Enzyme design. Structure first.
Site, PDB file in Angstrom:
ATOM      1  N   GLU A  32      29.803 103.735 -18.653  1.00  0.00           N
ATOM      2  CA  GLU A  32      30.513 102.481 -18.553  1.00  0.00           C
ATOM      3  C   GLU A  32      29.489 101.430 -18.118  1.00  0.00           C
ATOM      4  O   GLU A  32      28.771 101.630 -17.117  1.00  0.00           O
ATOM      5  CB  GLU A  32      31.657 102.596 -17.540  1.00  0.00           C
ATOM      6  CG  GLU A  32      32.570 101.358 -17.519  1.00  0.00           C
ATOM      7  CD  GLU A  32      31.816 100.062 -17.172  1.00  0.00           C
ATOM      8  OE1 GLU A  32      31.049 100.086 -16.187  1.00  0.00           O
ATOM      9  OE2 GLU A  32      31.985  99.027 -17.887  1.00  0.00           O
ATOM     10  N   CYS A  86      36.448  97.908 -12.832  1.00  0.00           N
ATOM     11  CA  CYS A  86      36.245  98.973 -13.789  1.00  0.00           C
ATOM     12  C   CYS A  86      37.536  99.449 -14.457  1.00  0.00           C
ATOM     13  O   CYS A  86      38.563  99.712 -13.794  1.00  0.00           O
ATOM     14  CB  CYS A  86      35.566 100.180 -13.123  1.00  0.00           C
ATOM     15  SG  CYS A  86      35.125 101.550 -14.238  1.00  0.00           S
ATOM     16  N   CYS A 145      37.258 103.964 -14.298  1.00  0.00           N
ATOM     17  CA  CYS A 145      37.809 104.457 -13.053  1.00  0.00           C
ATOM     18  C   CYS A 145      38.868 103.443 -12.662  1.00  0.00           C
ATOM     19  O   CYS A 145      38.814 102.841 -11.582  1.00  0.00           O
ATOM     20  CB  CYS A 145      36.742 104.620 -11.952  1.00  0.00           C
ATOM     21  SG  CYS A 145      35.857 103.108 -11.489  1.00  0.00           S
ATOM     22  N   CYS A 177      28.659 104.236 -13.839  1.00  0.00           N
ATOM     23  CA  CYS A 177      29.647 103.166 -14.059  1.00  0.00           C
ATOM     24  C   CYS A 177      29.040 101.886 -13.523  1.00  0.00           C
ATOM     25  O   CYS A 177      29.126 101.593 -12.312  1.00  0.00           O
ATOM     26  CB  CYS A 177      30.942 103.502 -13.329  1.00  0.00           C
ATOM     27  SG  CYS A 177      32.364 102.703 -14.001  1.00  0.00           S
ATOM     28  N   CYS A 190      31.308  98.964 -12.106  1.00  0.00           N
ATOM     29  CA  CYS A 190      31.595  99.436 -10.737  1.00  0.00           C
ATOM     30  C   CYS A 190      30.416  99.120  -9.818  1.00  0.00           C
ATOM     31  O   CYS A 190      30.561  98.446  -8.792  1.00  0.00           O
ATOM     32  CB  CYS A 190      31.839 100.958 -10.720  1.00  0.00           C
ATOM     33  SG  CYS A 190      33.562 101.462 -10.803  1.00  0.00           S
ATOM     34  N   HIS A 208      39.990 101.182  -7.493  1.00  0.00           N
ATOM     35  CA  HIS A 208      39.734  99.951  -6.725  1.00  0.00           C
ATOM     36  C   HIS A 208      40.997  99.296  -6.176  1.00  0.00           C
ATOM     37  O   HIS A 208      40.977  98.713  -5.069  1.00  0.00           O
ATOM     38  CB  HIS A 208      38.937  98.942  -7.555  1.00  0.00           C
ATOM     39  CG  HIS A 208      37.535  99.376  -7.809  1.00  0.00           C
ATOM     40  ND1 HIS A 208      36.579  99.393  -6.815  1.00  0.00           N
ATOM     41  CD2 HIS A 208      36.940  99.869  -8.921  1.00  0.00           C
ATOM     42  CE1 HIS A 208      35.445  99.858  -7.307  1.00  0.00           C
ATOM     43  NE2 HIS A 208      35.640 100.169  -8.578  1.00  0.00           N
ATOM     44  N   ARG A 235      33.746 109.266  -9.194  1.00  0.00           N
ATOM     45  CA  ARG A 235      32.283 109.207  -9.112  1.00  0.00           C
ATOM     46  C   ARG A 235      31.712 109.275  -7.712  1.00  0.00           C
ATOM     47  O   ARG A 235      30.503 109.369  -7.556  1.00  0.00           O
ATOM     48  CB  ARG A 235      31.731 107.992  -9.874  1.00  0.00           C
ATOM     49  CG  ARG A 235      31.786 108.185 -11.385  1.00  0.00           C
ATOM     50  CD  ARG A 235      31.788 106.888 -12.164  1.00  0.00           C
ATOM     51  NE  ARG A 235      32.002 107.198 -13.568  1.00  0.00           N
ATOM     52  CZ  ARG A 235      33.197 107.294 -14.138  1.00  0.00           C
ATOM     53  NH1 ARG A 235      34.306 107.073 -13.437  1.00  0.00           N
ATOM     54  NH2 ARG A 235      33.275 107.641 -15.414  1.00  0.00           N
ATOM     55  N   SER A 262      28.681 104.394  -7.895  1.00  0.00           N
ATOM     56  CA  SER A 262      27.518 104.177  -8.762  1.00  0.00           C
ATOM     57  C   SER A 262      26.489 103.258  -8.098  1.00  0.00           C
ATOM     58  O   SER A 262      25.316 103.264  -8.485  1.00  0.00           O
ATOM     59  CB  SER A 262      27.909 103.638 -10.127  1.00  0.00           C
ATOM     60  OG  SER A 262      28.716 104.584 -10.829  1.00  0.00           O
TER      61      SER A 262
HETATM   62  N1  FCO Z   1      34.653 106.669 -10.086  1.00  0.00           N
HETATM   63  C1  FCO Z   1      34.367 105.575 -10.191  1.00  0.00           C
HETATM   64 FE1  FCO Z   1      33.962 103.741 -10.388  1.00  0.00          FE
HETATM   65  C2  FCO Z   1      32.151 104.085  -9.927  1.00  0.00           C
HETATM   66  N2  FCO Z   1      31.049 104.296  -9.684  1.00  0.00           N
HETATM   67  C3  FCO Z   1      34.456 103.512  -8.750  1.00  0.00           C
HETATM   68  O1  FCO Z   1      34.811 103.391  -7.672  1.00  0.00           O
HETATM   69 NI    NI Z   2      34.148 102.830 -12.765  1.00  0.00          NI
END
Ligand code: FCO
Ligand code: NI
Ligand code: SF4
Ligand code: SF4
Ligand code: F3S
Ligand SMILES: [Mg+2]
Lengths: 544, 262
Positions: free
Chosen positions: A20, A67, A70, A538, A541, A74, A471, A494
């Protein structure tokens, strides 16, 4: 042995596809092995800057757009963050519903990652055309549970579909693949490629069901809309028929996880056993997830069924408690103004300042999160090691089933192969708990349907929301002033994994894991992709 | 056998939620779509090639003899000559401009590409813009954050088999965006009767009362959410949460605060 060229020089992969976001990876190779690396994130949006001055109740709807892969995580971190700042404790049903939606996200996210983002680094799709369907059906009986989709007939239809596709000359998403014409780093026999490919197409349909299950509680996928300050809004999600549908869909997804995903993962790991000694790191962090008590950040850390903790120098004999005060972000090698190093998220600063492409002093839009000065790997591997070290029963059984199957020591897991196996391991464990968690909420909601608590907006305050997303360790930090967002900082998995060097020039987990990567063919450096994809990057993210 | 129309899909300033939304299609499923209907010739999220091999795949697609359709996901960051958003060392604005130039048609999937989206919200640090504003060309907008796959795939299939569909003042296909969310909402009788939930914990909320007092933007939002649902099972208001107005231009600034009507 492991194919390695004699190549000496630089290699740049931009874009890194099948992740991503927008990542640029630079490496220096010497004699066919990576000796130095840089993780360069190529996009900034600035959600933290955008949230300043806004209603704290709106935060979750903005940050969820950090994101779409995922998705949800959030919105959950922001809800927990603001619930903590207003000092409200959510009702038991709200904890259960929030954790179940997270469970459904794990299932969807990991299935898609293995098959649609990672698998093409290990599987040669075109070589699947060389396979004899009958020989593939027999081999499928020797590596995985019996099923109709693995019959010679089914595998032949997949092959026939694939053959017509390739014979059209329009290769679409396979155009210029690193595996075209063969590649020394691809080991799988044609029979395995065919099996993997049939499952790849099946996963495309199965992910639609995993998303439906999540939408029953979440309202829709992507981007759920059922969480509010003090709990959840989805009363319907506590009722009989919706939860019966949720169970049925979840059971279908889990059958696919056990019949295809784990068996495919194990077969692949079996052929690429040499990757058990490539791409390892030393420090692991997890905030934990699936807590029995989410009335505060401390309670979350202590009651998460997937335990939280900190492992350093691979010492599985010392799992330390998470010190939320010991977290900070550096910007020395990032595209941000000078003077923003060593900031704790509550004092976070987001001041963008770009220089130029490939500037070794400033080469990423990601900040560099550090824990007491150390880079930390987060995600499935971190969680697996922490849970294993603490003797979590489900993790011990499954980790041991994997080690017993691959005939490797547990130390082999500190690697790209382990990182990949860990993701499968926890998917299997979430699957094993779905029926228990669903029953707990069904009985509770039938008994009492309270789903959201009463609360009051303080003039001034602060809070932190913790989560272990697919993640890794996720944390949202808010400062409220004049009943408004004064500061809002995101520190995302990430960011921990793929950010740049810290203030001491210390490499991040991905940069460090890339060191020692063998490059069979500099023109088609699949090995770089294997390790990077193992972290499940990601970038939206990471930078937000 | 039969040539499949070439589609180039670019990712600019986005969250990838639109790509995710697209693969949730079931009429047809994504595999049938890319195996039988179209030729998805560039798509960073799922394509096998990477780096220079991926950049070549894009340039081969842009030079195809039979032409191509362009799908754009995400907004365009314009500050500092577009350098805050890059792919393969090129500013996103530059690559989209190049690809838009010879496109048979341009479809903007998501509120981000259509109107600018979340990164455009005040104070807009990256000076992000919608595609049409950044390129100076008309686009077919499939907004929502993210839009329903029924709307996106519906538009794609329509564009390749029947031509451009009738568009509203905001470039949105009337087939999907010609009605207010509010006009098809099952809570409409509560609204007519002034039966509003005063909070999320209230008995009114438990009884499924209208969510207007809680900020619902259904009455000013054009989308088909209550008619078609998402994932064949739900939609926000069914899940007891107000509509945010995610399919309207600049909703991040015109629909906030989300939990109020002020
Ligand atoms: N899983 C995921 Fe996205 C990332 N890195 C978030 O929080
Ligand atoms: Ni993500
Ligand atoms: S429109 Fe929404 S879902 Fe689609 S890319 Fe933009 S932020 Fe993500
Ligand atoms: S909930 Fe929203 S869309 Fe439904 S009737 Fe009330 S105001 Fe209109
Ligand atoms: S929030 Fe968006 S998805 Fe539909 S319900 Fe409102 S337009
Ligand atoms: Mg941040």
């Amino acid at each position: 042995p492991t194919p390695q060229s004699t190549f000496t020089g630089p290699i740049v992969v931009d874009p890194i596809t099948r992740i991503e976001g927008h990542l640029r990876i630079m490496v220096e190779v010497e004699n066919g092995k990576v000796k130095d690396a840089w993780s360069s994130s190529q996009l900034f949006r600035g959600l933290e800057i955008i949230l300043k001055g806004r209603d704290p109740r709106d935060a979750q709807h903005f940050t969820q757009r950090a994101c779409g892969v995922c998705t949800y995580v959030h919105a959950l971190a922001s809800s927990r963050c603001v619930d903590d700042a207003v000092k409200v404790s959510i009702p038991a049903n709200a904890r259960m519903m929030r954790n179940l939606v997270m469970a459904s996200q794990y299932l969807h996210d990991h299935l898609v990652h293995f098959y649609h983002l990672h698998a093409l680094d290990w599987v040669d799709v075109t070589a699947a055309l060389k396979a004899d369907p009958n020989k593939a059906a027999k081999l499928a009986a020797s590596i995985a549970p019996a099923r109709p989709g693995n019959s010679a007939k089914a595998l032949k239809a997949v092959q026939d579909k694939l053959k017509a596709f390739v014979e059209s000359g329009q290769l679409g998403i396979f155009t210029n693949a690193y595996f075209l014409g063969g590649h020394k780093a691809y080991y799988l026999p044609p029979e395995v490629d065919l099996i993997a490919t049939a499952h790849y197409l099946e996963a495309l349909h199965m992910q639609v069901k995993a998303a439906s299950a999540m939408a029953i509680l979440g309202g829709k996928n992507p981007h759920t809309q059922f969480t509010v300050v003090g709990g959840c809004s989805n009363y319907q999600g506590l009722t009989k028929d919706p939860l019966a549908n949720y169970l049925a869909l979840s059971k279908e997804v889990c059958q696919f996880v056990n019949e295809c995903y784990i068996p495919d993962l194990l077969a692949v790991a079996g052929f690429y056993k040499d990757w058990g000694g490539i791409g390892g790191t030393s420090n692991y962090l997890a905030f934990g997830e699936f807590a029995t008590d989410d009335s505060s950040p401390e309670k979350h850390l202590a009651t998460s069924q997937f335990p939280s903790g900190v492992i350093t120098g691979r010492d599985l004999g010392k799992v330390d408690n998470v010190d939320l005060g010991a977290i900070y972000e550096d910007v020395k090698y990032s595209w941000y103004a000078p003077g923003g190093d060593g900031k704790h998220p509550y004092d976070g600063v987001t001041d963008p300042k770009y220089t130029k492409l490939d500037d070794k002093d400033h080469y990423s839009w990601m900040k560099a999160p550090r824990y007491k000065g150390k880079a930390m790997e987060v995600g499935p591997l971190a969680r697996t090691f922490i849970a294993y070290a603490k003797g979590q029963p489900d993790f011990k059984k499954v980790v041991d089933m994997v080690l017993g199957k691959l005939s490797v020591p547990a130390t082999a897991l500190h690697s790209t192969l382990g990182r990949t196996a860990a993701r499968g391991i926890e998917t299997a464990i979430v699957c094993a708990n779905m029926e228990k968690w669903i029953k707990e909420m069904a009985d509770s909601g039938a008994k009492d349907n309270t789903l959201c608590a009463k609360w009051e907006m303080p003039e001034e305050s602060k809070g932190v929301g913790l989560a272990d997303a697919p993640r890794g360790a996720l944390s949202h930090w808010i400062r409220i002033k004049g009943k408004k967002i004064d500061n809002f900082q995101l520190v995302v998995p990430s960011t921990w994994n793929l950010g740049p060097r810290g203030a001491q020039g210390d490499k991040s987990p991905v940069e460090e894991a890339l060191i020692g990567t063998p490059i069979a063919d500099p023109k088609r450096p699949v090995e770089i992709l294997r390790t990077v994809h193992a972290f499940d990057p990601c970038i939206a993210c990471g930078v937000h | 056998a039969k040539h499949r129309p070439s589609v180039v899909w670019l990712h600019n300033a986005e969250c990838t939620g639109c790509t995710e939304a697209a693969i949730r299609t079931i009429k047809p499923y994504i595999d049938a779509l890319i195996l039988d209907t179209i030729s998805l010739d560039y798509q960073e999220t799922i394509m096998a090639a990477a780096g220079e091999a991926a950049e070549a795949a894009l340039h081969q697609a842009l030079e195809g003899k039979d032409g191509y359709y362009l799908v754009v996901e995400g907004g365009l960051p314009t500050i500092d000559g577009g350098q805050w958003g890059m792919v393969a060392g090129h500013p996103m604005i530059e690559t989209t401009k190049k690809a838009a130039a010879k496109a048979k048609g341009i479809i903007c999937i998501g509120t981000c590409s259509a109107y600018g989206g979340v990164q455009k919200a005040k104070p807009n640090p990256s000076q992000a813009k919608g595609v049409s504003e950044a390129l100076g060309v008309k686009t077919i907008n499939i907004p929502g954050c993210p839009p329903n796959p029924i709307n996106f795939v519906g538009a794609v299939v329509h564009v390749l088999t029947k031509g451009i569909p009738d568009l509203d003042e905001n470039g949105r296909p009337k087939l999907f965006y010609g009605e207010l969310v509010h006009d098809n909402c099952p809570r409409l009788p509560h609204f007519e009767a002034s039966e509003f939930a005063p909070s999320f914990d209230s008995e009114e909320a438990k009884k499924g009362f209208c969510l207007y007092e809680l900020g619902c933007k259904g009455p000013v939002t054009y989308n088909n959410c209550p008619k078609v649902l998402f994932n064949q099972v739900n939609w926000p208001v069914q899940a007891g949460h107000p509509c945010l107005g995610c399919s309207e231009p600049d909703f991040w600034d015109t629909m906030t605060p989300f939990y109020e009507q002020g």
